[PDB]
Amino acid sequence: SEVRTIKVFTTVDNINLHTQVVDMSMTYGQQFGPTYLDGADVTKIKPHNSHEGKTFYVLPNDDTLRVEAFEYYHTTDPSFLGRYMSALNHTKKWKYPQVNGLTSIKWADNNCYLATALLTLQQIELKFNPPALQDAYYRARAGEAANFCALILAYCNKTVGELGDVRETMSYLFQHANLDSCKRVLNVVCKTCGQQQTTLKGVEAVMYMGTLSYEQFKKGVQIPCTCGKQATKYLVQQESPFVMMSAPPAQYELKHGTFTCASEYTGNYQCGHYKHITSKETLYCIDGALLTKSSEYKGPITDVFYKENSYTTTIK
Ligand SMILES: CC(=O)NCc1ccc(-c2cccc([C@@H](C)NC(=O)c3cc(NC4CNC4)ccc3C)c2)s1
Ligand SMILES: [Zn+2]
């Protein structure tokens, strides 16, 4: 029969909108290629009357859109938008309650580790490079974290419903944050082999696997030396706003005011449950929407975060 149209906007970044005219007889797919509205796939759907003036997301099919996409997300992975939108379709349905003055996530689709990562980021000093993470993270801090979670999932190449590692998640995010000015100096000491000194910049300057205790890392930790005689690695100098100390879950006692926040993991490798412990006027345990408060804490801790500016050892 007749040809009806509506006006809509197409975007890759929801910053630069592009006025398009669509035909209400043809599917979005046929006219634009893959097309999303609020993360919902509409490729196979014909325009509705209500669609007038709404913003749709499309894949970058021309060079103008490729520049706009790369500038915003800092990636040229063709699958990225599809994944960002697939995630978003789920993450818009999650509830983000304000818990202890911080945005959490009400438990759903094994998001316990995203919730824990989100509560953590709010407590440490981080500047993201991708304008996509800068923007979503600002809105997350406000209670509006639907997009930030969908982006974490997209960057970390994760499915909705699949349980993630908080330390793997955080590493990925730190790869997309400005940490150029972060600097760590380690000394490794043997009885024979002598004192070797290394310097670590960026992600490797703020992350350590093998001890939870920041104080222990400064005193010294035992490591298997190449020679075969256990050597002592100790921290000589740290320049970072924070440090992340990680180790495989173990009964650990956390004391008020000796740490910033910690990741509790109960259960078995890849199928457990995450809780967030934070240190304020007392110890808070944030379990999605659920909050409890205690003087003391012992439990299976796997990540502890500490605030820092400049530490310099007095050793030697
Ligand atoms: C029987 C008993 O006493 N304890 C059981 C355990 C043995 C080992 C454990 C362990 C070891 C390391 C880390 C942990 C915790 C902190 N991490 C995860 O489980 C983990 C890992 C992955 N994906 C792998 C690819 N990137 C790592 C995905 C999701 C999760 C929750 C856990 S827990
Ligand atoms: Zn040695």
| 110/66 Cα distance (integer angstroms) | 33
The reply to whether ligand 1 has any atom less than 6 angstroms from the CB of 249 is yes
Residue nearest to atom 11 of ligand 1 (CA): 248
| 28/33 Cα distance (integer angstroms) | 7
Q: Are 113 and 166 in contact (CB under 8 A)?
A: yes
- Known binding-site residues for Zn(2+) equal 190, 193, 225, 227
Q: Are 27 and 43 in contact (CB under 8 A)?
A: yes
Q: How was this structure determined?
A: X-ray
Residue in this structure with the two tokens 């103008």, named with its chain if needed:
64
Q: Is 273 a catalytic residue?
A: yes
What SS3 string covers the chain? Answer: CCCCEEEEEEECCCCCCEEEEEECCCCHHHHHCCEEECCEECCCCCCCHHHCCCEEEECCCCHHHHHHHHHHHCCCCCCHHHHHHHHHHHHCCCCCCEECCEECCCCCCCCHHHHHHHHHHCCCCCCECCHHHHHHHHHHHCCCCHHHHHHHHHHCCCCCCCCCCHHHHHHHHHHCECCCCCEEEEEEECCCCCCEEEEEEHHHHCEEECCCCHHHHHHCEEECCCCCCCEEEEEEEEECCEEEEEEEEEEEEEECCCCCEEEEEECCCCCCEEEEEEECCCEEEEECCEEEEECEEEEEEEEEEEECCEEECCCC
The reply to whether ligand 1 has any atom less than 6 angstroms from the CB of 302 is yes
Residue 89: both structure tokens together:
């379709």
Instruction: List the catalytic residue out of 112, 149, 156, 182.
Output: 112
Q: For the sheet with 242-255, list strands across it.
A: 207-209, 242-255, 296-307, 261-266, 273-279, 283-287, 290-294
User: Between β-strands 283-287 and 231-239, what pairing exists: parallel, antiparallel or unpaired?
Assistant: unpaired
Amino acid at 158: K
57 to each of 157, 218, 286, how far by Cα in Å? Answer: 20, 50, 35
Which numbered atom of ligand 1 lies nearest the CA of 274? 31
Ligand nearest to the CA of 162: 1
The reply to whether ligand 1 has any atom less than 6 angstroms from the CB of 130 is no
Ligand 1 pocket check: which of 110, 112, 165, 266 to mutate, most ligand atoms within 8 Å of Cβ?
165
Distance 275 CA to ligand 1 centre (A): 14
User: Between β-strands 242-255 and 207-209, what pairing exists: parallel, antiparallel or unpaired?
Assistant: parallel
Cβ neighbours for 67, distance < 8 A, ≥ 6 positions apart: none
Q: Are 313 and 128 in contact (CB under 8 A)?
A: no
Q: Are 311 and 237 in contact (CB under 8 A)?
A: yes
Instruction: List the catalytic residue out of 18, 74, 256, 273.
Output: 273
Which numbered atom of ligand 1 lies nearest the CA of 113? 31
How many other CB atoms are found less than 10 A from the CB of residue 79?
12
Amino acid at 74: H
Q: Is 287 a catalytic residue?
A: yes
| 167/112 Cα distance (integer angstroms) | 13
Cβ neighbours for 35, distance < 8 A, ≥ 6 positions apart: 10, 28, 29, 41, 42, 43, 56, 57, 58
Q: Is 74 a catalytic residue?
A: no
For this entry, resolution in Å reads: 2.9
The reply to whether ligand 1 has any atom less than 6 angstroms from the CB of 164 is yes
Distance 300 CA to ligand 1 centre (A): 11
Q: Are 207 and 160 in contact (CB under 8 A)?
A: no
